[PDB]
Amino acid sequence: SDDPLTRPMAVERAKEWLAPLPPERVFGNSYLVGFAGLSVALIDTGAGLVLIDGALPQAAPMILSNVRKLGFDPRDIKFILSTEPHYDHAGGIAALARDTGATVVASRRGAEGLRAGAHAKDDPQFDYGGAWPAVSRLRVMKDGEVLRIGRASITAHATPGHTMGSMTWSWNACEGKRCKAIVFASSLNPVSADRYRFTAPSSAPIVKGFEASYRRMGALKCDILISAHPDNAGAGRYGSGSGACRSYAERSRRLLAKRLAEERRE
């Protein structure tokens, strides 16, 4: 069995990214089933399960194992939400969709990258090239659109900048009468291949994209923040409490400012 959808990528970086963690309940019906360096969430909606992201291709079996350790059947995963079409977050999604029958859910631009399993021309990391497992079974959400399943309501928020189709997901998780607003934030890291310039006129959609993302992340109700790379939000697997999403955005803003200045230095 040479499985195209799980054949490993980035095996050296994966030693850190995929370091194991026990799966844990976040709050309510919502759980973490990812790794030390890459977040994967699992929502039990009462009418099926929803996963958020899929890590690397070889992570798909590890994710399904974690889902089982929590007592769930992966055959009940109905949707896999995608924050971005890069192989460290989408790499395992095709395998997960194959094995579960789930529909993959993304932004319009995100879906285009998922279908291709390759970088789009306006992706800051286009020049890195490469290919990763492509996805075909795709549902596009518009910015502000809500996915309702079981008793859960998940809102899609376009949060471009890292790529044009990067997308953040929010929903409420409840325990008895107490509910918390959870945000699973796409990366906002301004990184690129070597020759890419964020200050080029052709990059303006990406830079205006970051500005819209900062405004969105400042507006969200955000009792709990799960960052696609959890170290971007700090120590531990998620951050909580007033201000988390705003701090996350400010971190990105500071990195972007530093990057723009770097490009404007002689």
Only one residue has tokens 């959808």, namely 5
Query: Which of residues 86 and 109 has its CB atom nearest to Zn ion in the complex?
Result: 86
Query: Which of residues 120 and 149 has its CB atom nearest to Zn ion in the complex?
Result: 120
Task: State the Cα angle at 93 between 8 and 181, rounded to 5°.
Answer: 125
Q: Is 173 left (phi over 0), alpha (psi -120 to 50) or beta?
A: beta
127 marked ligand binding residue: no
Q: Is 109 in the site for Zn ion (CB under 5 A)?
A: no
Piece of the chain touching Zn ion by CB under 5 A; list 39-47, 85-93, 114-122, 238-246: 85-93
Query: Which of residues 28 and 92 has its CB atom nearest to Zn ion in the complex?
Result: 92
**C-alpha R_g of the chain:** 17
What's the CA gap between 144 and 212, in Å, rounded? 13
Name the phi and psi angles at 225, rounded to 5: -115, 120
44 marked ligand binding residue: no
Tokens of 57: 């291709």
Contact assessment for residue 167 and residue 156, using Cβ atoms and an 8 Å cutoff: yes
157 marked ligand binding residue: no
Coil, strand, or helix at residue 38?
Answer: coil
Tokens of 232: 């971007």
Q: Is 86 in the site for Zn ion (CB under 5 A)?
A: yes
Query: Which of residues 86 and 157 has its CB atom nearest to Zn ion in the complex?
Result: 86
119 marked ligand binding residue: no
> What's the closest the beta carbon of residue 13 comes to Zn ion, in angstroms?
10
Query: Which of residues 158 and 173 has its CB atom nearest to Zn ion in the complex?
Result: 158
Piece of the chain touching Zn ion by CB under 5 A; list 22-30, 40-48, 88-96, 150-158: 88-96
Q: Is 88 in the site for Zn ion (CB under 5 A)?
A: yes
Binding-site residues for Zn(2+), please? Answer: 84, 86, 88-89, 162, 229
Footprint of Zn ion (CB under 5 A): 86, 88
